[PDB]
A and B are shown apart, each in its own frame.
With several copies, the nearest count.
Chain A
Amino acid sequence: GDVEEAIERAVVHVADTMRSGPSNSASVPALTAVETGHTSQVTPSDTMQTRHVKNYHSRSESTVENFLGRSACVYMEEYKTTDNDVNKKFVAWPINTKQMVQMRRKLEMFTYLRFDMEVTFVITSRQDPGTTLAQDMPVLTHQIMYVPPGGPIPAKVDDYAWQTSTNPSIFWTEGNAPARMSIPFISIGNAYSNFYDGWSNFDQRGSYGYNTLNNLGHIYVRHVSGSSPHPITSTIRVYFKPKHTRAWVPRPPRLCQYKKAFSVDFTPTPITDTRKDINTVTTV
Chain B
Amino acid sequence: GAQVSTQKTGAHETSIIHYTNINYYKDAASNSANRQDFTQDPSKFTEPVKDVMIKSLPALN
**Chain A residues with a Cβ under 8 A of chain B:** 1-9, 11-12, 27-29, 31-33, 36-42, 46, 58-60, 63, 65-66, 69, 114-117, 182-185, 243-246, 250
**Which chain B residues (1-45) contact chain A, with CB distance < 8 Å?**
1-6, 8, 10-12, 16, 18, 20, 27-38, 40, 45
Q: Is the CB of B40 within 8 A of A184?
A: no
Of A12, A31, A59, A116, which one neighbours B11 at CB under 8 angstroms?
A116
A94 to B59 alpha-carbon distance, docked (Å):
52
Tell me the complex Cα distance, A118–B56, Å.
49
What is the interface of chain B mostly: helix, strand, loop, or mixed?
Answer: loop
B33 CB contacts on chain A under 8 angstroms: 65, 69, 243-244
User: In the complex, which of the residues A63, A69, A183, A246 contacts B29, with contact meaning CB atoms closer than 8 Å?
Assistant: A183
Question: By the criterion of a CB under 8 Å from any partner CB, how many residues of chain B are at the interface?
Answer: 38
Show the binding face of B for A, using Cβ within 8 Å.
Answer: 1-6, 8, 10-12, 16, 18, 20, 27-38, 40, 45-49, 53, 55-60
Shortest distance between the CB of B49 and any CB in chain A (Å): 5
Nearest 3 A/B pairs, CB to CB = A33-B59, A184-B29, A185-B11
When A7-B5, A7-B18, A12-B38 are in contact, do A243 and B47 touch as well, CB less than 8 Å? no
For the A-B complex with A244-B11, A244-B34 known, give 15 more contacts whose Cβ atoms are closer than 8 Å: A3-B20, A4-B1, A8-B6, A12-B38, A27-B57, A28-B58, A42-B55, A114-B11, A115-B11, A116-B12, A182-B30, A184-B8, A184-B10, A243-B32, A245-B11
A170 CB, min distance to chain B CBs, angstroms: 15
B residues in contact with A32, CB < 8 Å: 59
Contact A244 B47 (CB under 8 A): no
Residue of B nearest to A115 (CB): B11
Can you list 10 pairs linking A and B with CB atoms under 8 Å apart? Answer: A12-B38, A38-B49, A39-B47, A41-B47, A59-B38, A63-B40, A182-B29, A183-B29, A184-B10, A243-B31
Contact status of A1 and B32, CB under 8 A, knowing A36-B49, A37-B48, A60-B8:
no
- Residue of B20, B40, B53, B57 near A12 (CB, 8 A) is B40
Given A69-B35, A185-B10, residue A41 in contact with residue B49 (CB < 8 A): no
